[PDB]
Structure 1
Amino acid sequence: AANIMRVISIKNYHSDIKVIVQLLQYHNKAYLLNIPSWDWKRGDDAVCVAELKLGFIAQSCLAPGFSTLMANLFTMRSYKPTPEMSQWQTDYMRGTGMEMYTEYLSSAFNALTFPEAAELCFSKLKLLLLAIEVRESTLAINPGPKVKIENATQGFFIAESAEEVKRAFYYCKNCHANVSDVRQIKKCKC
């Protein structure tokens, strides 16, 4: 109730501010969806921790450890070894170095299917591409061979840093295509 009255006060002062609000209870969301000037298409959003909590653990009923797989993607962390860690802890912690990033696919991806683009990102770029913004426009997760990469398609990657995913934007089918070590994929390949 206190946070809804802050949203109302912000939106009363100026309607077009993007407001992002943390809500503790799901039934309280309806009250702010009904504010006249709240608009999810303008980017307003309510991070409902009750909805999200139960959603993450419910996916663990479908895939037993998935709440941990997925919650680690949404906090920024860098992998940092220490010699007392067992093998399983180092494997785990390297996995926690991952986050999910959005970046534009380079023109070298144009007219590939999503499966070719995902094979290419994984094998050459060391990037796990898992979804794309299909141009209104809509998110598609792991789309089948029927979906081509259109020009300037935004892709969704799992990677260790934003410095990694840039490689999808800089990759070039003539200039970089023979590179052995991914650190050399750089500088737009002009």
Structure 2
Amino acid sequence: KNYHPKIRIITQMLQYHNKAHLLNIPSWNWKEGDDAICLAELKLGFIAQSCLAQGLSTMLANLFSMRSFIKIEEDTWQKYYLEGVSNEMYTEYLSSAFVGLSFPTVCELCFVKLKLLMIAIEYKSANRESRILINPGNHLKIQEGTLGFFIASDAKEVKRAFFYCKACHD
């Protein structure tokens, strides 16, 4: 960051207590892409979620890997599994048609119509303080400019949320 203080960097850490030192560098802006990956926070977090619902250590660890979609035919516990190993988290901006709708109406309109599962939104409370909200209830409505966190098998199908309107796509 001395040599070029605009570059995006991505760092693996080994402890959690000393990824606070990366805040002290003045060029380090995590809002621009400088995200450090802690390994003792995510390993002991995926295990701590499996104490709540067993399987989330491999529910999540298949959602960020480009898995080789081979097709098994005769087997039964591996055929149902490998159809669920090609699903990945993609982001796409919501279209203008969703504005004003509540969150549970949107996920219904994404899964019934688009055949996309939508897990979370990015609520613009502030442009410098934008929280990320997994599955809110009826308290929220979709703003123009909330980012849609999807789960899909293809990068093509996730673009169809930006093209949802009540004229021809519906």
TM-score, normalised on structure 1?
A: 0.80
Corresponding residue number in structure 2 for 1:5: none
Corresponding residue number in structure 2 for 1:164: 157
Corresponding residue number in structure 2 for 1:45: 35
Deviations 1:130-160 (A, max 9, x none): 1111122221111111211122421100111
RMSD: 1.7
Stretches of structure 1 that go unaligned for 5 or more consecutive residues are: 1-10, 178-190
What are the equivalent positions in structure 2 for 1:17-166 lying under 5 Å apart?
Answer: 17-77=7-67, 79-84=69-74, 86-135=75-124, 136=126, 137-166=130-159
In terms of fraction of residues, the more helix-rich structure is: 1
For 1:56 and 1:120, the matched residues in 2 are separated by: 30
Letter in 1 for 2:105: E
CA contact 1:78–1:160 (8 Å) conserved in 2: no
Which has the greater radius of gyration? 1
RCO greater where, 1 or 2, for CA within 8 Å and sep 6 or more? 2
1:78 Cα deviation from its structure 2 partner: 5.5
Decide which of 154, 167, 170 is 1:174's aligned counterpart. 167
Letter in 2 for 1:22: Q
Number of residue equivalences? 166
For 1:152 and 1:14, the matched residues in 2 are separated by: 31
1:58 Cα deviation from its structure 2 partner: 1.0
DSSP 3-state at the match of 1:74: coil
- Aligned-pair identity (%): 65
Deviations 1:4-31 (A, max 9, x none): xxxxxxx111222222111233344233
Segments of 4+ moved more than 3 angstroms: none
For 1:138 and 1:112, the matched residues in 2 are separated by: 19
For 2:67 and 2:94, the matched residues in 1 are separated by: 24
